[PDB]
Amino acid sequence: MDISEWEKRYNEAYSDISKSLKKVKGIFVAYNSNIDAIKHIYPRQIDSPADFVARLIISMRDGKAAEVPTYTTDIHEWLTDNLGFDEARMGGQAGIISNLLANMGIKNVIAYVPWLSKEQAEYFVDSENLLHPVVENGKLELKHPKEAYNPDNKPKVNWIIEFSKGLEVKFAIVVPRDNRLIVSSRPPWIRIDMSEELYEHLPEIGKNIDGAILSGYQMIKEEYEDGKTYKDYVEKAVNVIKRLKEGNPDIRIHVEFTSIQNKLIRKAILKDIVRKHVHSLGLDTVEVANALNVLGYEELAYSVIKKDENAIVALYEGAVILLHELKLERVHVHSLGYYICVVSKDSPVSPEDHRKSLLFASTVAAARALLGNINSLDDIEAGLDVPVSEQGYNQLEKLEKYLVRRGICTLEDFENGCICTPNHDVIIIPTKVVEKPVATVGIGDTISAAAFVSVLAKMKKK
Ligand SMILES: Nc1ncnc2c1ncn2[C@@H]1O[C@H](COP(=O)(O)OP(=O)(O)S)[C@@H](O)[C@H]1O
Ligand SMILES: O=P(O)(O)OC[C@H]1O[C@](O)(CO)[C@@H](O)[C@@H]1O
Ligand SMILES: [Mg+2]
């Protein structure tokens, strides 16, 4: 059943997208930057080490990627001496995406972070593509991160413990698949916010860009020390989105969702700031269930997190509901062997061009695995040598047999990757997976970011 024509679709997509990546004016990427600390190997937050080991055991028996936060530096000095990290890389949704797009030659990459530190600026690439906004003397100044940063700000470091093959140790029992645990520092001084002056010059920033990639809203707490609610930061998160559209009407705005422990913050994010002011959303199989658990579809959410064969068809239905419940124009869910992107019929980009974006995003993710990171637009070309994962092609077979028997799409339509339903459209591709990747943090942000910028390029709104 496996047709070798898919290798031809990847090749003709890379050249067509790379030749269009000059059509984008700029991108605005904001709110998430930290320094990862990779360590080589029911509690809701980490206050004492007994909680850290407990949350590690959950990841050791499910193989699920769980992100849990710490608020005090009481355990920063705990691990830093008891357990030495071996590598420190650029981390955060906005940070990785800022480096990726700059390394791709995307023009006018505008990266903003509230906590910009002296140690943090050294991790950003040095190029005319990547610039940070500082509003000094009442006017908009886009200066390099190396220089326009605040000295009083101290860095934000996160601990990442990753492991594979499930090397087991019994205490007083083997990890199924590869899994990583993220211990994120959320000190009281970091806030998802921006200066009042930079909040004023947002129409200027929007007029010189074509898209915005926003992520990091999980830093918002319910209660603050200065007596401010999560609704204010939720309100400000929208008004920043609003003022960007006031300088550009045709700007598309993407939000890269992430695992959020607090369901009340998770729901307030999906309902108050993503529902109507956002067009694009990026997810993974586990976050779709997370999104359903707050919108009111837990039966389907449990079906997504379940292990049966019909879990993928639940992931399909989960993506469709997220596209309609949230009034979204695009939903990009990325899995290990395949991508699933459901798109509205209002989409300013045809389903034919939606496929090339996913094929390109799949080409970028493979090169991201082989090379430590990507340094040029031509480096992505290396990603075409990774073979298409047959496991991903066979996972779609369970979904294909379910869709052609339901009567939604044609057998021809699925083998090509373009399904046209009466109210929405779906694009499905098998991705390219490396047996021995070099680094596996950031691959997710890279898929949605590379796919999102490829859409703005091929947009006829130019
Ligand atoms: N070897 C390899 N080769 C190609 N592509 C890969 C590979 N490994 C993973 N992937 C992708 O990473 C995604 C996880 O991103 P996720 O959002 O879950 O993680 P982060 O938020 O840390 S970037 C997963 O859905 C896969 O499509
Ligand atoms: O929510 P936080 O603490 O910024 O962590 C975001 C995580 O996402 C990553 O960018 C991986 O996608 C890591 O660098 C980081 O651990
Ligand atoms: Mg992710």
Author numbering: 1 to 41, 65 to 195, 199 to 488
Would you copy out the relevant sentences from the publication that reported this structure?
Nonetheless, in some archaea from the phylum Euryarchaeota, a modified version of this pathway has been described, where glucose and fructose-6-phosphate (F6P) are phosphorylated by homologous enzymes that use ADP instead of ATP as phosphoryl donor. The ADP-dependent sugar kinases belong to the ribokinase superfamily and their members display a highly two-domain conserved architecture, a large domain with a Rossmann-like fold and a small α/β domain that acts a lid of the active site. The active site is located in a cleft between both domains, connected by a region of flexible loops that act as a hinge during the ligand-induced conformational change.
The structure of the AncMsPFK in complex with F6P-Mg-ADPβS was solved by molecular replacement and refined at 3.12 Å resolution to Rwork/Rfree values of 0.24/0.27. However, 28 residues from the small domain cannot be solved in this structure; 24 of them belong to helices α2 and α3 and 4 from a β-turn located between β-sheets β9 and β10. Analysis of residues involved in sugar binding shows that F6P is mainly stabilized by hydrogen bond interactions. The strictly conserved D471 residue belongs to the GXGD motif and corresponds to the catalytic base that activates the hydroxyl group of the sugar to be phosphorylated, for the nucleophilic attack toward the ADP. The phosphate group makes contacts with N32, N34, E90, N181, K179, and Q244. Analysis of residues involved in the stabilization of the close conformation of AncMsPFK reveals several interactions between the large and the small domains, governed by hydrogen bonds. These polar interactions include residues located close to F6P (R212-Q244 and E90-T284), and others such as arginine residues, far away from this sugar (R67-Q287 and R112-G397).
